[PDB]
Amino acid sequence: GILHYEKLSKIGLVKGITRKYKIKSNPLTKDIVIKMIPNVSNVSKCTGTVMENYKSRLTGILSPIKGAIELYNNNTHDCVCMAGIAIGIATAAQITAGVALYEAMKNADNINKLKSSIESTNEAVVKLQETAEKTVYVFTALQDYINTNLVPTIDQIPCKQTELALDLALSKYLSDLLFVFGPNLQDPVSNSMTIQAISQAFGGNYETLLRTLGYATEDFDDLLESDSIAGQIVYVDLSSYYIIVRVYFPILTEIQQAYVQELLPVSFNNDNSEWISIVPNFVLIRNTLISNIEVKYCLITKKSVICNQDYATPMTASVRECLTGSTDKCPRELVVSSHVPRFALSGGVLFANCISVTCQCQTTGRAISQSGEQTLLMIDNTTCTTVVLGNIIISLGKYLGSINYNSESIAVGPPVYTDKVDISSQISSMNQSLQQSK
Amino acid sequence: GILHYEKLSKIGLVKGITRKYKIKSNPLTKDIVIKMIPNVSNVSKCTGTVMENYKSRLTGILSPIKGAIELYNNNTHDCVCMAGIAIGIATAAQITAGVALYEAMKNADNINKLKSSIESTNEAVVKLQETAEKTVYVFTALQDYINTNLVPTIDQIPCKQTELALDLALSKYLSDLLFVFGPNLQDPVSNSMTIQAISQAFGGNYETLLRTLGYATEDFDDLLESDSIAGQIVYVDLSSYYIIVRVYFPILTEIQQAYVQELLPVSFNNDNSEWISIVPNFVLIRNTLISNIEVKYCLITKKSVICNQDYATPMTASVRECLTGSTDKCPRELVVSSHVPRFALSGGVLFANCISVTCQCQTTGRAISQSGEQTLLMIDNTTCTTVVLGNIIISLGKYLGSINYNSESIAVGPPVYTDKVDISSQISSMNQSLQQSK
Amino acid sequence: GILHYEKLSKIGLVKGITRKYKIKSNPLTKDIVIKMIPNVSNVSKCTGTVMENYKSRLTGILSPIKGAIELYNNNTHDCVCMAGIAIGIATAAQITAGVALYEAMKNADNINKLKSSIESTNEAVVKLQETAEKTVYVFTALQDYINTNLVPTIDQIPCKQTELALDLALSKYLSDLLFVFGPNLQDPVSNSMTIQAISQAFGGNYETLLRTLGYATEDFDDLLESDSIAGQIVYVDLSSYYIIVRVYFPILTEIQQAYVQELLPVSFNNDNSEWISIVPNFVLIRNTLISNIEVKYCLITKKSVICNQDYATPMTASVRECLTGSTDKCPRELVVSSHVPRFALSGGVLFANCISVTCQCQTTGRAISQSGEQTLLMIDNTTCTTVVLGNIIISLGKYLGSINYNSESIAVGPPVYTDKVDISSQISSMNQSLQQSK
Numbered sequence A, B, C: 001g002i003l004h005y006e007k008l009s010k011i012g013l014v015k016g017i018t019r020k021y022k023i024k025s026n027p028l029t030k031d032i033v034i035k036m037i038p039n040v041s042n043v044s045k046c047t048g049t050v051m052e053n054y055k056s057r058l059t060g061i062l063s064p065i066k067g068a069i070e071l072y073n074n075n076t077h078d079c080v081c082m083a084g085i086a087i088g089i090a091t092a093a094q095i096t097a098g099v100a101l102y103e104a105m106k107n108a109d110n111i112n113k114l115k116s117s118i119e120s121t122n123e124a125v126v127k128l129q130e131t132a133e134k135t136v137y138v139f140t141a142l143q144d145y146i147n148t149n150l151v152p153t154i155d156q157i158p159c160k161q162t163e164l165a166l167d168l169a170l171s172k173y174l175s176d177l178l179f180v181f182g183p184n185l186q187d188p189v190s191n192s193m194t195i196q197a198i199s200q201a202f203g204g205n206y207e208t209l210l211r212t213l214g215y216a217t218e219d220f221d222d223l224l225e226s227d228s229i230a231g232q233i234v235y236v237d238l239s240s241y242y243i244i245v246r247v248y249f250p251i252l253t254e255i256q257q258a259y260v261q262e263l264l265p266v267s268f269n270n271d272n273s274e275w276i277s278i279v280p281n282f283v284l285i286r287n288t289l290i291s292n293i294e295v296k297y298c299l300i301t302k303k304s305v306i307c308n309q310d311y312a313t314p315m316t317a318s319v320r321e322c323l324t325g326s327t328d329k330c331p332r333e334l335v336v337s338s339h340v341p342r343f344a345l346s347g348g349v350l351f352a353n354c355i356s357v358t359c360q361c362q363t364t365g366r367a368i369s370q371s372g373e374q375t376l377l378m379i380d381n382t383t384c385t386t387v388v389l390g391n392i393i394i395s396l397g398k399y400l401g402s403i404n405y406n407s408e409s410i411a412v413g414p415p416v417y418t419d420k421v422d423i424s425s426q427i428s429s430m431n432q433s434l435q436q437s438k
């Protein structure tokens, strides 16, 4: 690759798995209905004031979301035609989500004609014919719990306990719902809300939601774990207590001439001390351009790095030069923890710090020795066919690089400290020196 | 406001929603009892050794908490009168919590006179008359589960399976409880423990707790999501296995002459490349003082920023000058990701980077062009009444700033890189240069 | 200790609790079987296609894990001998985990001889005789739910609702399972994944797992909360849908001549302003060596700091000199928030910023005054026996340090700003100054 792997390997940074870059795109939209209140028609004998109190509590949660949705519904018309003077302040994502909301209102209007049928649902999952060809699924929360726990036990227990059990179930449902659908949800007009978060209105059963929707594909689990499947609330009903959610199932596009290269950090010896290299562990290479990538927001598999959006971030010229060969530009940090890697395997070849760990060859019985002028030792089956590292015995391959690897040395970079307080102290010391300098 | 909004918008910092500052204060205290063990009197036929093992396991969890509480209970008198010699080491928060614990012990002593009544509770929520006027609520864990699942199925299933079901429910209850009430809780003498965390002793039903306690308030959900409602364990019983928790319910005070200003980041063009501005997105302004605010610990709504404590943090003079007009002091960062904003709306006026995106006007049909010397374009209805951005059509309004906005240019700040490894490399390179100079 | 506690306290770093350092070591291994599919033989009348669909969905989840495990199984032989040529790329942790997997395969082969007995399990927890002396426990998911909820209600409700209830339970089980056992688990050959994460295959009942395994020890909860108890998947069956997990039980080893010292930050007055000190709050001292420690990954109790591995990190020379007495090297930060501590107690002695908070003595009735040249006031019973801080009254001990503490002053360190944008701006400004100089 573009990176100088041979020079990188001598300061740790052993070449790891090469993964292709995938980003979701081209979503397909399906509409579902989540009914936030169960049907207690069959336990209504002693529901008491529990349902009235629950409806009063749920109206206060659903009302701000509805108001924020009609804020964009009222100011979007047909020339998608948005009035910026009434909207006032919005971001590009908010305006795009408003456009998507306007597009979804066409189907929401057809769905809303089945309000009585939605009210009459008495099962957790039901199918309704929105049109002659389109079917809408209604997902009722706690309906399964009521049907399988409260209906069979109405006449067995004093149903004053059924009222308390129903009250506790509704409040526990609200307890899990409040983190996602509460005041934290200040921007319901957005398509970045994952289906897992939306499923909290259905008890967290996004598996049931997606399986019922019939979304079958090879990349289903990858899309789920990359947070690429998203839902958007397009309508809120305060009389029947249900929401219409549009689920956007996209497909993964492999970015052409793009891959993510992983570097395995290995401690190396320098100046009679143990060091580690402070460089990005994951490097994104698009065409011939080298840049950082925030892989913590992505899904990392053994074959590809999967993200819901482009997470590329800039890279300094010094770090780019370090990755392209200038090993003197690579920052390094002292090693004081005993639990730090000291060897790694790449292409059947072992890169080990044989000063911190004991390297012994099984073929000859003689220990492999590392001098004080060598940072790492490259052990292939030319040096000797089988090396022993304590309880580990490994058969080695042949190195595809230079034959004088262990004879040719390099230069090491400047030591650094990556702790927050240490960074602040370094900045202070450098400023107290720079004031004298200038 | 005090900020220079025009110059900030010229570098892509578009003015956002202005929110007032709210901090909780003046809490009212209520005492509740949480019984960590259910009443199995009606399933006692084949509970077996399960209850003995559960009590043995729960004693080891509750003993350190009781010891830590008695550490402060034993060293507080009337001469709130605290003996610092015996306490030894404590913080201001710990001492204030000890004072609150001493205040709560007066009511805890009255509550403890109903120990037999607490032991005899056989419902999830019961009401006990602590005095002639005060009422205390007892919340029993898994009591509803036992009453609605195990009691009705005593004679139907082989009750050796009931013993296994009871054992699994208790162990699952301990599994969720251990993260909050385990060795992590090293400081039970503190009033910073949220009611949501305390509710883990009741299966996570803080909604049930707060609804039973009453607590009718408009700011109820805001207080819940700002982590302002807190509870404190004031007494632990190792014989009846219950705890007394004092719930603190504060009110939200709007800080006078204080508001939080949000800045919407928009990419801008400079030197034939795309850049973003590295400035705080949320700026707290109290009176005429500008400072940072850690909004990640607060609750953000469309109307206010709500925090459980003051989260103001200092700001550098350079950043303050950047926010007050000195745009040459504003750090900027290169843009390499495709998924960063290019336009935003503020006051009916669109600030767009018409080089990265296509700006076309519907009224005239001609594309809106941005020269290479302009960072951003301000598009108001004085220019043209309706702009088109791909699939988005927006009606704009008059701008309230300078009429020569698109003719007047500004200066741009120094480029920076905000990655961790990039920061370390920059610090090392700058130290190398400084050492070479001196 | 090695730290200069007096000078540290004079800049608001009051000595806290001294905790010893503990790291897990010498694990003992026990093998368990988790059956990912329940036995629905007693509700098979109307399970329908639900079980077939669930098996199809679960095969896709479990197949990559089995493939990754067989990747190491196929390339490990008795000759522990590993073929590095076929492995290609691996880290030291991966190779050690492969060695552990090879060691566990010997017992996995004996366990797999009871495949029919594992298939026939119809209880949540059962005991099987793997050999004449060894015992293996099988944990079946949702088996208790089926036995106690679906079997008793087979003929009471329309069993078409039983099929929907079974479908929802299986899908909810998969929803919780997907985060741990989904595409995120790209490296099943590793012994660093905790038993709590493993328990997600059993509904999160790690308490049941460990109690059934019979692991009884004093440090049980400490090992649990330090993330020291870990499990490794050693075998995956795609025909019976179960996994074999080897649980590692380490012991907590107290590091000799090592302890973690905590410093309590207290605001202090300087130049008519309030400041805080930016130094590490937790300092790890091993022998005579001072270094940082990442205590966020560890478990902190009142007696010791417990970690699953060594988390020591380097410390700069400037920060070390600050901790050892050079108070002019200690970075300090301005105080703008009202909710920052102003006093603390250590050894019965109060260190308070009496400029910011009102200090009054009860014994004499006269207020304690702090001059503008003093950062903090040390108040012991030599000064006066009982101090009052608002609603707090504390009896004080005697200071064991210098008697001229409040008369001797020190020098203060350079001011710093710890915000991210502030750090970037400071770096840019210092680079601009350095470039102007050179």
Ligand SMILES: *[C@@H]1O[C@H](CO)[C@@H](O)[C@H](O)[C@H]1NC(C)=O
Residues within 6 Å of the ligand: A067, A070, A071, A074
């Ligand atoms: C939107 O318009 C409806 C009437 O169509 C009105 O009831 C509602 O209050 C409006 N909401 C907003 C936010 O303007």
Ligand SMILES: *[C@@H]1O[C@H](CO)[C@@H](O)[C@H](O)[C@H]1NC(C)=O
Residues within 6 Å of the ligand: A042, A122, A123, A147
């Ligand atoms: C409610 O009860 C009636 C009569 O007992 C029954 O026909 C109906 O199916 C029940 N509803 C549900 C959802 O089971």
Ligand SMILES: *[C@@H]1O[C@H](CO)[C@@H](O)[C@H](O)[C@H]1NC(C)=O
Residues within 6 Å of the ligand: A348, A381, A396, A397, A398, A399, C085
């Ligand atoms: C050494 O490893 C290489 C792998 O590159 C392999 O082809 C070769 O057979 C091995 N043995 C020898 C003696 O080269």
Ligand SMILES: *[C@@H]1O[C@H](CO)[C@@H](O)[C@H](O)[C@H]1NC(C)=O
Residues within 6 Å of the ligand: A425, A426, A427, A429, A430, B427, B428, B431, B432, B435
């Ligand atoms: C700067 O470098 C010198 C020598 O290279 C070193 O002694 C000093 O500690 C370094 N300081 C910082 C803040 O990096």
Ligand SMILES: *[C@@H]1O[C@H](CO)[C@@H](O)[C@H](O)[C@H]1NC(C)=O
Residues within 6 Å of the ligand: B067, B070, B071, B074
């Ligand atoms: C507190 O005092 C009680 C007796 O009133 C005693 O049993 C207990 O052990 C003491 N605890 C501590 C921490 O001193």
Ligand SMILES: *[C@@H]1O[C@H](CO)[C@@H](O)[C@H](O)[C@H]1NC(C)=O
Residues within 6 Å of the ligand: B042, B122, B123, B147
């Ligand atoms: C326990 O059983 C008795 C007799 O069947 C009954 O009177 C009592 O109400 C039951 N307890 C509860 C809490 O239901």
Ligand SMILES: *[C@@H]1O[C@H](CO)[C@@H](O)[C@H](O)[C@H]1NC(C)=O
Residues within 6 Å of the ligand: A085, B348, B381, B382, B385, B396, B397, B398
């Ligand atoms: C531009 O919008 C303002 C309101 O913001 C309006 O008063 C003015 O007449 C508009 N000019 C047009 C439509 O040309």
Ligand SMILES: *[C@@H]1O[C@H](CO)[C@@H](O)[C@H](O)[C@H]1NC(C)=O
Residues within 6 Å of the ligand: B426, B427, B429, B430, C427, C428, C431, C432, C435
């Ligand atoms: C400092 O600024 C110069 C020019 O402004 C630039 O070339 C260099 O990369 C910068 N270095 C750092 C560490 O900011």
Ligand SMILES: *[C@@H]1O[C@H](CO)[C@@H](O)[C@H](O)[C@H]1NC(C)=O
Residues within 6 Å of the ligand: C042, C122, C123, C147
């Ligand atoms: C399944 O049903 C049979 C016949 O009713 C019964 O003997 C057996 O115990 C049941 N299985 C379980 C696990 O209860």
Ligand SMILES: *[C@@H]1O[C@H](CO)[C@@H](O)[C@H](O)[C@H]1NC(C)=O
Residues within 6 Å of the ligand: C067, C070, C071, C074
């Ligand atoms: C491992 O070997 C088995 C046969 O023993 C084979 O079925 C399987 O595909 C192999 N897996 C890998 C990753 O080589």
Ligand SMILES: *[C@@H]1O[C@H](CO)[C@@H](O)[C@H](O)[C@H]1NC(C)=O
Residues within 6 Å of the ligand: B085, C348, C381, C382, C396, C397, C398
């Ligand atoms: C002051 O505190 C010390 C420390 O415990 C104590 O020994 C002494 O009795 C106290 N009183 C006096 C008058 O020294």
Ligand SMILES: *[C@@H]1O[C@H](CO)[C@@H](O)[C@H](O)[C@H]1NC(C)=O
Residues within 6 Å of the ligand: A431, A432, A435, C415, C416, C426, C427, C429, C430
């Ligand atoms: C450097 O120090 C000077 C005076 O000591 C100060 O004015 C300036 O703000 C500091 N710059 C930093 C900390 O970036």
